[PDB]
Amino acid sequence: EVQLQQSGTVLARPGASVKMSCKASGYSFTSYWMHWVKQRPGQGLEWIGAVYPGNSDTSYNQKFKGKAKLTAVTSASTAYMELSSLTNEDSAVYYCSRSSLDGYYVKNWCFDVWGQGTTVTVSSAKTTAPSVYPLAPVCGDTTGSSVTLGCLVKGYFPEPVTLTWNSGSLSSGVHTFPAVLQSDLYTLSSSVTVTSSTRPSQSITCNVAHPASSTKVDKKIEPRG
């Protein structure tokens, strides 16, 4: 079965360099052009370049002549891409993909196999653990039937953080939102709705984990007095 394993996320301070891998398995590596595609959030896929491992030849989008260097190691079935002079602009997902036809002269074809993507985050921001504040309803507002409780997770970097409600035992009626950038730092929230009989008669606790700063906290949600 044909795979392309890409390397893990990288963080990089502006102006820096970064090099990523793409380990190809289960077909003749030297016979197919490996392509690199870039994807920034809401902005569509751009083609960067491609390398022909069978003769180590390479073709680059004019837009990346400066930016990218592609290389292959054929003993290892791997292709590499190295991006230099980093910028916020270069913060994106980068994919390698296999041309769907073998052969050297089918340079511009489509791709049948993609890798899961490598994430490049380019930031001057420092590693910060998040503040975890609990959201409890407006003083004395157990409304009609249900009750929504929340969790605010503020000013951390880098991504990600992972949240659960009551150690993960409580899991429907949860909405966890995608993080957003405030200045340098990420912030995200999560809601959980549950029947007004469940609470404040039982304990509901928010569980945030930020692996990047080795933080694990639990805010129990307390009624407001």
Binding site: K63, Q116, S131, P137, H175
Partner: protein
Amino acid sequence: DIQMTQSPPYLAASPGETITINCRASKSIRKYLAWYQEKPGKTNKLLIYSGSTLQFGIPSRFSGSGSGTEFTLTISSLEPEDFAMYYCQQHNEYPLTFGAGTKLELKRADAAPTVSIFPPSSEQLTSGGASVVCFLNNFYPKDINVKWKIDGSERQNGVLNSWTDQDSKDSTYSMSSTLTLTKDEYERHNSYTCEATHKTSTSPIVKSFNRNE
């Protein structure tokens, strides 16, 4: 470069119906256009190449037509798993380029949002910050406006919104708006309002609280 424009960007539909989306090239690309399905937690799948050829292993409900300048993709009979993101890529010349994408959404019953507003946590107050959070939950369609009012005045600065994608259980969206103030600015006012205007109601859904309450 050749420029792809895919239309529509968005599209809602239901299991069983047909849809067909567009991709237009800025110049002639002979017959050479491919289509990719993009789905969270899975690698991009090739669906069609050269305008009309099925990729090995792709169901025959996917079909493609076009040549020169105008192409389509058609899904004959939408399957749950077909709700996804589709891109077109031209394979006629250097440099390869893509369209922007079409997002294919599962249509369901209009659903009014369940609003909730939350005052700053005391732990936040103590450290000098004050964030008021407002959860707008389980609504359809996706279009919504939220409005922060301080003591009656609409306040735009310091508001950060985030939307979830279409829910895997009931297909609804959910939102969270967080206006962030300095604790000093926070106490300078009394009335905090979150107003949500949504297709389901001619009048906005308002929720607020008074700082001393």
